[PDB]
Amino acid sequence: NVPHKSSLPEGIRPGTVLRIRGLVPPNASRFHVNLLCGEEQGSDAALHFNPRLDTSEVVFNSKEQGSWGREERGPGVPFQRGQPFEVLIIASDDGFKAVVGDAQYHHFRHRLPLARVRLVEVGGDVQLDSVRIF
Template sequence: MALSHSVPFETSVPEGFEIGTVLKIRGVVPSEANRFYINLLSCDKPDSDIVLHFNPRLDQSIVVMNTMECGTWGSEERVFPNVFQRGQPFELLLIAMNEHFKIVVGDSESYEFIYRLPPKRSCLLKVGGDVSLELLKIF
């Protein structure tokens, strides 16, 4: 994909997230940032299920992960500490493993989110909020 994506950003994931699929994001968290999100959705309709909602909340110093099915949010998984820092660049890998998403940030922190919805259902990627994207690649 091209460099310097404007936010909000969305792209289709026509093959879905098969086991072994990797999403690589390189970006910068603006100095006045509060929150941003990375969502994997089942389609591009407003009431689409969210297979993965990854939400660094700099205003609360946590990362929240969740799903939304049939318009209802699941239970939040809150992770401490939040390794995203205002004014700092980051590199994130989101990897579809056998039973969970593995999210690796830089070379210092990783998160796991056990599948509640099959990753194969992911057909749309959306990134939004307080973030600047430099690189986004799915392989």
């Protein structure tokens, strides 16, 4: 329904956890979690995490200067229509580790420097219960 967009006054440092709890709606096609490097339209994306129910895949990518990078795909799709979910996106010096439910899902190594991130957005077909930056 209502998407999330918030600024990060301390950015994302190693040891920062983004926790997203919500529910994939019955009619979901896809939704996204972005870690962006600016407020402006078309800012670079250090992380684009994109569960796609319509095409049965979870895509990870980065975006620089308006261009999407190399797509990575996670193993299987740990999201289903109508079902609650919990995602941790955990930053370290080496990359982002996505935890879905009770299982480590995918390790997305940094393409852009982590220190560039200063916005998080969550949107698309998703009902959010809570978005927290720890």
